[PDB]
Amino acid sequence: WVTVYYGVPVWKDAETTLFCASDANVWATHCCVPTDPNPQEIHLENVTEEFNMWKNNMVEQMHTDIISLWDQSLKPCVKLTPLCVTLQCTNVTNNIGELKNCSFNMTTELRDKKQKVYSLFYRLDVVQINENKEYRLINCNTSAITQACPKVSFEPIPIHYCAPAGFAILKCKDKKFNGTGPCPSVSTVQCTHGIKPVVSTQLLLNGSLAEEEVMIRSENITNNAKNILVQFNTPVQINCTRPNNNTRKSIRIGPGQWFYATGDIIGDIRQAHCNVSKATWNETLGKVVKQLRKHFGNNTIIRFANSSGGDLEVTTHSFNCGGEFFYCNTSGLFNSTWISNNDSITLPCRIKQIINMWQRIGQAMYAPPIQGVIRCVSNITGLILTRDGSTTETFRPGGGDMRDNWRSELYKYKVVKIEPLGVAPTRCKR
Amino acid sequence: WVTVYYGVPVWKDAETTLFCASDANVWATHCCVPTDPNPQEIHLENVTEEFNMWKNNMVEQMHTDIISLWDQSLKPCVKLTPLCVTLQCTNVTNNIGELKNCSFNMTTELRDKKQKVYSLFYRLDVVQINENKEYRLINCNTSAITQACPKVSFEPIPIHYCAPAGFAILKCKDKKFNGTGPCPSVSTVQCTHGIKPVVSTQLLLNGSLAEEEVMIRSENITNNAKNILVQFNTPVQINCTRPNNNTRKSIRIGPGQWFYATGDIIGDIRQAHCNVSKATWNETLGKVVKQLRKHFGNNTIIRFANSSGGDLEVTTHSFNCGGEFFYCNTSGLFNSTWISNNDSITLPCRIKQIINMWQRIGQAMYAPPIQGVIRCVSNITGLILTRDGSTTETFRPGGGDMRDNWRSELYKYKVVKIEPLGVAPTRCKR
Amino acid sequence: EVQLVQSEAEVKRPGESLKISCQTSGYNFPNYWITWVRQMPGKGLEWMGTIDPRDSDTKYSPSFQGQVTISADKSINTAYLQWTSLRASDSATYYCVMWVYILTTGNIWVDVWGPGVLVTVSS
Amino acid sequence: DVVMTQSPLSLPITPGQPASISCRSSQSLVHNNGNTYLTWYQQRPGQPPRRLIYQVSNRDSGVPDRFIGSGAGTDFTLKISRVESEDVGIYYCGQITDFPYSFGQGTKVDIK
Amino acid sequence: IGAVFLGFLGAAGSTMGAASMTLTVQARNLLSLTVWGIKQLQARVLAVERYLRDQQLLGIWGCSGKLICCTNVPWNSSWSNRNLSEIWDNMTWLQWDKEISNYTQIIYGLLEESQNQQEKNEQDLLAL
Amino acid sequence: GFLGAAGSTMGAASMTLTVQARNLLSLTVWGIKQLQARVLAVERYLRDQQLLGIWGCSGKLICCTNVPWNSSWSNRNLSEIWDNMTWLQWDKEISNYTQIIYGLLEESQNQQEKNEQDLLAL
Amino acid sequence: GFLGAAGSTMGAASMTLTVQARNLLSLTVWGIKQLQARVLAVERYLRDQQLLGIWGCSGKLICCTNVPWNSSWSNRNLSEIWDNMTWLQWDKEISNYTQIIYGLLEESQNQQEKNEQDLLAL
Ligand SMILES: CC(=O)N[C@@H]1[C@@H](O)[C@H](O[C@@H]2O[C@H](CO)[C@@H](O[C@@H]3O[C@H](CO[C@H]4O[C@H](CO)[C@@H](O)[C@H](O)[C@@H]4O)[C@@H](O)[C@H](O[C@H]4O[C@H](CO)[C@@H](O)[C@H](O)[C@@H]4O)[C@@H]3O)[C@H](O)[C@H]2NC(C)=O)[C@@H](CO)O[C@H]1O
Ligand SMILES: *[C@@H]1O[C@H](CO)[C@@H](O[C@@H]2O[C@H](CO)[C@@H](O[C@@H]3O[C@H](CO[C@H]4O[C@H](CO)[C@@H](O)[C@H](O)[C@@H]4O)[C@@H](O)[C@H](O[C@H]4O[C@H](CO)[C@@H](O)[C@H](O)[C@@H]4O)[C@@H]3O)[C@H](O)[C@H]2NC(C)=O)[C@H](O)[C@H]1NC(C)=O
Ligand SMILES: *[C@@H]1O[C@H](CO)[C@@H](O[C@@H]2O[C@H](CO)[C@@H](O[C@@H]3O[C@H](CO)[C@@H](O)[C@H](O)[C@@H]3O)[C@H](O)[C@H]2NC(C)=O)[C@H](O)[C@H]1NC(C)=O
Ligand SMILES: CC(=O)N[C@@H]1[C@@H](O)[C@H](O[C@@H]2O[C@H](CO)[C@@H](O)[C@H](O)[C@H]2NC(C)=O)[C@@H](CO)O[C@H]1O
Ligand SMILES: CC(=O)N[C@@H]1[C@@H](O)[C@H](O[C@@H]2O[C@H](CO)[C@@H](O)[C@H](O)[C@H]2NC(C)=O)[C@@H](CO)O[C@H]1O
Ligand SMILES: CC(=O)N[C@@H]1[C@@H](O)[C@H](O[C@@H]2O[C@H](CO)[C@@H](O)[C@H](O)[C@H]2NC(C)=O)[C@@H](CO)O[C@H]1O
Ligand SMILES: *[C@@H]1O[C@H](CO)[C@@H](O[C@@H]2O[C@H](CO)[C@@H](O)[C@H](O)[C@H]2NC(C)=O)[C@H](O)[C@H]1NC(C)=O
Ligand SMILES: *[C@@H]1O[C@H](CO)[C@@H](O[C@@H]2O[C@H](CO)[C@@H](O)[C@H](O)[C@H]2NC(C)=O)[C@H](O)[C@H]1NC(C)=O
Ligand SMILES: *[C@@H]1O[C@H](CO)[C@@H](O[C@@H]2O[C@H](CO)[C@@H](O)[C@H](O)[C@H]2NC(C)=O)[C@H](O)[C@H]1NC(C)=O
Ligand SMILES: CC(=O)N[C@@H]1[C@@H](O)[C@H](O)[C@@H](CO)O[C@H]1O
Ligand SMILES: CC(=O)N[C@@H]1[C@@H](O)[C@H](O)[C@@H](CO)O[C@H]1O
Ligand SMILES: CC(=O)N[C@@H]1[C@@H](O)[C@H](O)[C@@H](CO)O[C@H]1O
Ligand SMILES: CC(=O)N[C@@H]1[C@@H](O)[C@H](O)[C@@H](CO)O[C@H]1O
Ligand SMILES: *[C@@H]1O[C@H](CO)[C@@H](O)[C@H](O)[C@H]1NC(C)=O
Ligand SMILES: *[C@@H]1O[C@H](CO)[C@@H](O)[C@H](O)[C@H]1NC(C)=O
Ligand SMILES: *[C@@H]1O[C@H](CO)[C@@H](O)[C@H](O)[C@H]1NC(C)=O
Ligand SMILES: *[C@@H]1O[C@H](CO)[C@@H](O)[C@H](O)[C@H]1NC(C)=O
Ligand SMILES: *[C@@H]1O[C@H](CO)[C@@H](O)[C@H](O)[C@H]1NC(C)=O
Ligand SMILES: *[C@@H]1O[C@H](CO)[C@@H](O)[C@H](O)[C@H]1NC(C)=O
Ligand SMILES: *[C@@H]1O[C@H](CO)[C@@H](O)[C@H](O)[C@H]1NC(C)=O
Ligand SMILES: *[C@@H]1O[C@H](CO)[C@@H](O)[C@H](O)[C@H]1NC(C)=O
Ligand SMILES: *[C@@H]1O[C@H](CO)[C@@H](O)[C@H](O)[C@H]1NC(C)=O
Ligand SMILES: *[C@@H]1O[C@H](CO)[C@@H](O)[C@H](O)[C@H]1NC(C)=O
Ligand SMILES: *[C@@H]1O[C@H](CO)[C@@H](O)[C@H](O)[C@H]1NC(C)=O
Ligand SMILES: *[C@@H]1O[C@H](CO)[C@@H](O)[C@H](O)[C@H]1NC(C)=O
Ligand SMILES: *[C@@H]1O[C@H](CO)[C@@H](O)[C@H](O)[C@H]1NC(C)=O
């Protein structure tokens, strides 16, 4: 009674490689596969499936590709290892300290010539050697430093991921899905929505919002070794700036080899900072607490404390805006105890140019100076929190892997392998 | 009534990736798949086709791949950026200035040692900085210079282009075809004839000749922004030379790296030049004029003037002979007015060693010296002319795209995609 | 090409029953759907209902759900709409619309309307 | 149910000039099979309606290039690149759903 | 009516007796600027290999060119003791695939041998 | 010759189908282009074979189906089509209907297989 | 047991045809080479399948044609060929007629399809 059928609607969980796609230079010229102007989404009637955002290989692929693309983007660029010399250094010109005015003897287009050049630097990229004082660039003892090409943008233009033939992606429509287990309402797509390849630490600056309620997801909650990812159901408006009209100059250091140096500052010298709506922020923390209590007790007191110590990438909120790297002191955002029964918060931010973009050793990128004045506007869509671990449950903001900023969009998607061949008994025989 | 037919002899206009083939260290050092010793051509009876040589992307691939090959050939070669030093330089010694004797402080295999090195340079590759006088190599502020490995010849050995499975190339047999429309007589080939990947500017010196008459082709003629490609039905012979017996020496510049430079002059000093048969050239232009008049009027006066001012790459006729780079003054060839109703022309030529082969910035090739005396013989097969734009129509020789030297051979070919599956009404039913 | 042929216009007094019909011709297709619509003077269309003649399965519009019925008749390439009785409010132009559907595609390649047949109610 | 309105419902058009008609739904016209089902019809006076556009933007057979469809969700429209006297009549935005099937209000196009 | 097309996986949640009508929908979708593009070439090649393995088996079993084929191989009961009235009407293909997954290789081996015997017999008849 | 039948009329050309069918599939940098070309030729080949499979025309160069011609696609007489037209001209003549004809072929084959199973089950 | 039939006579060996058929489909350094190997294996598979298609033997491991043996290709008795020779010896024995037989198989199939179309049109 055996009958063989082909085109059977079954699948198995499988790990495959997804490809990127784009809707009409980093990211910007990464045309990938052009997207479908009007993609089809197929609801699966009667179909449920289990998802697990903490074990999602799609997250691993975004990491793999994002990191690879940034390394590839520096391949043709001018190296700054020729700048690893001793610098003589003093203050800039200010009354009463982040900036330094340092000078050195640099190479020129000819091997027989040298030039005296100088530029402005941020303290965080410069270290004293002679414990004017003598300094070296802080990363020259351990890593290569490569200048990013000044013509290349890293704007996080959203890209889509798509399954290859033989594969399809299942997507959740469950507004309350907590990242794991059965997902009662699903559909199948070939491609995910576009996701901005944003890098951040403590705050999630430009993702999607929860449909109804703030969603709190964690691999465990109970286990304090795990992170808690909080997805807001409304954005928080944040305005950041580097309020200094800076100029830039190029230096010829070799045959077609140019270095971009900070020139001077027009006007006042001011600290970089971010403005977070105070009223909105207080409301969002209250919403977070109401939802956090579901795991801690209805009348359990929840406290928001500041970050733990360590490198700026884990103690501050960092981001890339205008090409500059900001390290914002978010302690001003986490100062509250929530007990059962217009204005703004200004966070100072530090600026760095030599960046270990993926927290790796040996590959440092130098961010060339950005001219003019920088203004950044973003939608905070979520937080990365950890438990500070008996009547009060304290949470602190903190950093984590870049993977955690991507699973935040990818938790709704799973990829499976289509297996169209199979058999069943019937009443027929040849 | 519907019958499905498979293997239907139909096609669509198409563009695919072509591959080279060759009829068995030089040029195509990776070579190509061997060609068919006896290639076929299928005359197509009662078939017409439409060609457009100006939209023929077979040309684009030839261009793209020649560049790729060129760059790959320089990958393992010695860099000459270590030569970007100040030169102490004077005249080599002659009576009442093309060559200069320049000396410099060069590196050796050890970093602690230096050597005094001198060699000869052409004035076109050297710039005075102290406006012996102080000079530098002209490109040391702008580009990296790579020595072509002297072991690699670039003789433009002809190759055939071949279509991949699923594709075919249609070819014209129309001896009067101008490449901008329908071709009443065609045939099918898998591969093109062998085409020499030759680089030139004003004249095409080794391509195919017209079968019967001088052919003049242009995308428009009327529109002066377009070039005119002239194909001769007869060759014009040119005898070129670099009549200077020179020696070569190598300098170790570092471990495993040698720099090749002209040692001395062991004969007289003479200008490079080319001898074109005078009688043939005069007859040749007369033929061109007879055909040009078809677009300008039988009683319209046609004048040949020399090229416009600008860089040698666009004002002179350049070519590669023996690996040497010549820049010839063709003014002597285009100095006459044609009005309706043994000897040679000697053209002086300049010699250069640093070549921006693809007119790119930052990537320069250095041609190593050739010992002995260079003699090179060629065939004018065609010209690149422009209109100098009330009864006189003046034309000038000029440069053009590198692609224009190849579309002149590929104008007869079109790539089509084979589409074997289709249907038609029949009187049969299952 | 595909055409629908409709029956003659007719007039009834209120309380009298009526059968109206369409026929399909000019093509040879497998699955197709038939639907009826009504156009009231000065108005756009009201959906009356649809049937797949292959299976003889009808959903109907909520309007007229219990007032008018339809037949099937795939075997003779026709379609019918039957009123149990007519009311003055039923005077309108009636249409059959055929939707040619491919079972493997999900598309309606043919959307054909008859010209419209009047059914009127008088005294 | 899918309740469909149109706007404007009266559209005199300068002859030879472009114009468009809005189509607005009570709910999404996206089906579980992933396709959006919405069609446009042209009913000239004295004629049955003709389908012009299939599945929001697919110009149907023999349909003039003058008719361009677009939209998503609940927001749809018909654009006419130039309006001819031939285009005078009532345009309808038809609704294909999970039943009941319905038609929108209808927009009259005239020349002025 | 209901415009039922369902879609690519379509009614993956429907029972087998309803689901095996869209077999063609799935079959038609199984085949569907510088460097590092090897990732896509690898994906293309693997898709081809999967396709070919399925086609080869249909060939070996004598079911080539069909979405549904009857064989002359018996159901051996121990594989599944469910009634056809239960299998086709109250189970989906996904549930079914799991239900008999441990017999995949048994059934496939039996199918190959049956076809081997059938071709042998046809040749004996054509040689007659 | 592979395209020798290209100028032939349809009634003359559809005898050489094997000539065309049998020629359809036939160390460093750039080897990727060569590999890509081979892969793409395979994909094209497989799509055609899959459709012939789907329509019930597997293994044939010519197959009759049980699907009728619906006229609007082409109102030419079969004698005009087969004797006074080439396949290239014909391909253009009915280009826009490709998806209709194929949709009908696909539906028909499914109905035929369904009916075969009902008979084998009887 | 893939080559288990390798030393068997032809009449004994042609029972394991399935066994072999079912086993035919089975970074820089060690990067590109494996992709090249997969592609080439695919092309080999497909060329054999296309020929079986062309000759009307698609879907079969054993198929009869209507082409006669012409004697001159091999004058051995069939009882000698099937019982006292292996396939390897045999393939060598007639290797120079491969293209003749294949051309005949192809032409025969074309004639058969043409005749079937005429009959289905009758
Ligand atoms: C526009 C255009 O390109 N037109 C082409 C012409 O350029 C082409 O002209 C030929 O060009 C080739 C390459 O430049 C010339 O070949 C060189 O010849 C010299 C001299 O060799 C002589 O002695 C040899 C002894 O056995 C003889 O075999 C040979 O025929 C000569 O008699 C060689 O020295 C060159 O290179 C070889 O030696 C060097 C030494 O270090 C090696 O490094 C090289 O790898 C190589 O081994 C070349 O062989 C050729 O003579 C040119 N022809 C003429 C007439 O000048 C022309 C074809 O003739 O076609 C036009 O279209
Ligand atoms: C969260 O999402 C928000 C919203 O998308 C992002 O904010 C945007 O970020 C981009 C990139 O930083 C901002 O775009 C930049 O705007 C600058 C100013 O534009 C005005 O002034 C120029 C002056 O010539 C006008 O041309 C222009 O039309 C505007 O009037 C530009 O100067 C920036 O660079 C551009 O010019 C340079 C010139 O050489 C080019 O090299 C650049 O490639 C580019 O063309 C750039 O366009 C955008 O304004 C931001 N929006 C807002 C509301 O601020 C957040 O960054 C994002 N958050 C995160 C974390 O990703
Ligand atoms: C520290 O920062 C200053 C700029 O902010 C660096 O540049 C120095 O700026 C002063 C003031 O503009 C220059 O002095 C002026 O020079 C002109 C020359 O003709 C003279 O006319 C003026 O009266 C005045 O002297 C100074 O030369 C300039 N230095 C250089 C090298 O350009 C300064 O170099 C920075 N120091 C370090 C260590 O980076
Ligand atoms: C977080 C933040 O401060 N964002 C800045 C905005 O506050 C700022 O103010 C906006 O001005 C508009 C003028 O009418 C108001 O309508 C708008 O509500 C107001 N935005 C907020 C959040 O209050 C704009 C400048 O217009 O710049 C943002 O960066
Ligand atoms: C019809 C059929 O094949 N039924 C299978 C049973 O025969 C099989 O059990 C049999 O058990 C014997 C105990 O010694 C074994 O020797 C015998 O080989 C085995 N038969 C087969 C075909 O393996 C049961 C085992 O689960 O499955 C039935 O499907
Ligand atoms: C199966 C078969 O016949 N293969 C051909 C070879 O036999 C043939 O070999 C040549 O056969 C001749 C017969 O007398 C010999 O004289 C000749 O020396 C021999 N050649 C070689 C190289 O051994 C070859 C070449 O003609 O073609 C095969 O198709
Ligand atoms: C999902 O399951 C429901 C319930 O079993 C199915 O609904 C039945 O569908 C059949 C047709 O297949 C109807 O005859 C029944 O009346 C329906 N019953 C009910 C209570 O709805 C449904 O078809 C299944 N598949 C889907 C909805 O995709
Ligand atoms: C930031 O500095 C730039 C100069 O680097 C300022 O540009 C000035 O723009 C006005 C516009 O008319 C020009 O007239 C000036 O000559 C420009 N300055 C120079 C030095 O050329 C720019 O306005 C400054 N921006 C801010 C926000 O202060
Ligand atoms: C963030 O800002 C706070 C506020 O200035 C810094 O901590 C302060 O350090 C001073 C030093 O004596 C203390 O007096 C303040 O009471 C501290 N405030 C708080 C809230 O602790 C803090 O170190 C900054 N953190 C980062 C990462 O820059
Ligand atoms: C910018 C700089 O550092 N310049 C110093 C120069 O002032 C000093 O005189 C020389 C050695 O004496 O070494 C150079 O590096
Ligand atoms: C989507 C969802 O709520 N998932 C799980 C739920 O399945 C599980 O039962 C619960 C603890 O048992 O933890 C939730 O996160
Ligand atoms: C090889 C060479 O040029 N060496 C010179 C040396 O002769 C000169 O004396 C010195 C400065 O005086 O500069 C060196 O580069
Ligand atoms: C290209 C070039 O240099 N042409 C020169 C021309 O400029 C000069 O005026 C003339 C004599 O005066 O001799 C020509 O060769
Ligand atoms: C900046 O000024 C402060 C004032 O005390 C001084 O200590 C510091 O060293 C100065 N920076 C440099 C680079 O000299
Ligand atoms: C919390 O508020 C108190 C109020 O005085 C302030 O002193 C303290 O620094 C604040 N802490 C943070 C982290 O901002
Ligand atoms: C924040 O979300 C709102 C939602 O519409 C959007 O309009 C706004 O532009 C968003 N802001 C940023 C910076 O993306
Ligand atoms: C070298 O040639 C130039 C050409 O103008 C001449 O001016 C210069 O004096 C010459 N130098 C010597 C040393 O002869
Ligand atoms: C190099 O020097 C030449 C001398 O004229 C100049 O034209 C060119 O622009 C210079 N290149 C750079 C990078 O400045
Ligand atoms: C050749 O030139 C003539 C000039 O008018 C033009 O009409 C003709 O179409 C051209 N033919 C081709 C094949 O380019
Ligand atoms: C080139 O030299 C050869 C040597 O015999 C001579 O025959 C030929 O005519 C010369 N060509 C020209 C253009 O002078
Ligand atoms: C360059 O000058 C030196 C000075 O000694 C001389 O020996 C050498 O021969 C000159 N170079 C040439 C090629 O004449
Ligand atoms: C150049 O001079 C050397 C000196 O021995 C001689 O051997 C060589 O043949 C000469 N070359 C030419 C082309 O005259
Ligand atoms: C010039 O063309 C003639 C034509 O036969 C050819 O024989 C000769 O070798 C060609 N000469 C060159 C230098 O290409
Ligand atoms: C071309 O037309 C002539 C006209 O009789 C015909 O004989 C010849 O066979 C045709 N060629 C083709 C390829 O059909
Ligand atoms: C097929 O569609 C194209 C779309 O531009 C149209 O031009 C063509 O006329 C249509 N087919 C026919 C036979 O007209
Ligand atoms: C090997 O030869 C012996 C000789 O009798 C035979 O019995 C045996 O079956 C042969 N093996 C094969 C594989 O044919």
PDB file of C-alpha atoms in Angstrom, chain B residues 70 74 78 80 83 120-122 125 145-150 152 154 242 248 259-262 319-327 351-357 364-370 374:
ATOM      1  CA  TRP B  70      47.490  43.301 -15.823  1.00  0.00           C
ATOM      2  CA  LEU B  74      52.316  42.808 -10.882  1.00  0.00           C
ATOM      3  CA  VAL B  78      59.275  44.385  -6.389  1.00  0.00           C
ATOM      4  CA  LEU B  80      59.857  50.841  -5.992  1.00  0.00           C
ATOM      5  CA  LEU B  83      63.371  54.682  -4.509  1.00  0.00           C
ATOM      6  CA  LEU B 120      69.721  56.887 -16.058  1.00  0.00           C
ATOM      7  CA  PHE B 121      66.274  58.325 -16.195  1.00  0.00           C
ATOM      8  CA  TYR B 122      64.132  59.916 -18.797  1.00  0.00           C
ATOM      9  CA  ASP B 125      59.655  60.611 -15.190  1.00  0.00           C
ATOM     10  CA  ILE B 145      55.264  52.485  -8.084  1.00  0.00           C
ATOM     11  CA  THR B 146      55.648  48.773  -8.788  1.00  0.00           C
ATOM     12  CA  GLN B 147      58.355  47.303 -10.992  1.00  0.00           C
ATOM     13  CA  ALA B 148      57.011  44.943 -13.559  1.00  0.00           C
ATOM     14  CA  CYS B 149      58.825  41.697 -13.183  1.00  0.00           C
ATOM     15  CA  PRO B 150      61.296  41.632 -16.178  1.00  0.00           C
ATOM     16  CA  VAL B 152      57.102  38.553 -17.757  1.00  0.00           C
ATOM     17  CA  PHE B 154      53.245  41.268 -22.297  1.00  0.00           C
ATOM     18  CA  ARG B 242      64.620  52.961 -30.012  1.00  0.00           C
ATOM     19  CA  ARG B 248      71.129  47.229 -17.719  1.00  0.00           C
ATOM     20  CA  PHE B 259      65.739  47.019  -8.949  1.00  0.00           C
ATOM     21  CA  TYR B 260      66.468  47.177 -12.612  1.00  0.00           C
ATOM     22  CA  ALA B 261      67.903  50.299 -14.115  1.00  0.00           C
ATOM     23  CA  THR B 262      69.682  51.525 -17.179  1.00  0.00           C
ATOM     24  CA  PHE B 319      52.481  51.845 -27.887  1.00  0.00           C
ATOM     25  CA  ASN B 320      54.292  48.968 -26.214  1.00  0.00           C
ATOM     26  CA  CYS B 321      57.215  47.489 -28.226  1.00  0.00           C
ATOM     27  CA  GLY B 322      59.437  44.939 -26.521  1.00  0.00           C
ATOM     28  CA  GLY B 323      58.073  46.220 -23.247  1.00  0.00           C
ATOM     29  CA  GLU B 324      59.202  49.765 -24.013  1.00  0.00           C
ATOM     30  CA  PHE B 325      56.763  52.670 -23.972  1.00  0.00           C
ATOM     31  CA  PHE B 326      56.718  55.054 -26.890  1.00  0.00           C
ATOM     32  CA  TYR B 327      54.861  58.359 -27.262  1.00  0.00           C
ATOM     33  CA  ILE B 351      60.211  57.295 -24.047  1.00  0.00           C
ATOM     34  CA  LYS B 352      58.816  56.880 -20.528  1.00  0.00           C
ATOM     35  CA  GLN B 353      59.256  54.282 -17.815  1.00  0.00           C
ATOM     36  CA  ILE B 354      56.493  55.100 -15.317  1.00  0.00           C
ATOM     37  CA  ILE B 355      53.225  54.171 -16.903  1.00  0.00           C
ATOM     38  CA  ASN B 356      49.713  54.845 -15.685  1.00  0.00           C
ATOM     39  CA  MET B 357      48.436  52.052 -17.880  1.00  0.00           C
ATOM     40  CA  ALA B 364      51.797  53.161 -11.419  1.00  0.00           C
ATOM     41  CA  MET B 365      53.838  50.556 -13.266  1.00  0.00           C
ATOM     42  CA  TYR B 366      57.564  50.880 -13.821  1.00  0.00           C
ATOM     43  CA  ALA B 367      58.900  49.449 -17.003  1.00  0.00           C
ATOM     44  CA  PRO B 368      62.304  47.843 -16.428  1.00  0.00           C
ATOM     45  CA  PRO B 369      65.034  48.643 -19.001  1.00  0.00           C
ATOM     46  CA  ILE B 370      65.704  46.601 -22.085  1.00  0.00           C
ATOM     47  CA  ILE B 374      64.698  47.944 -30.040  1.00  0.00           C
TER      48      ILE B 374
END
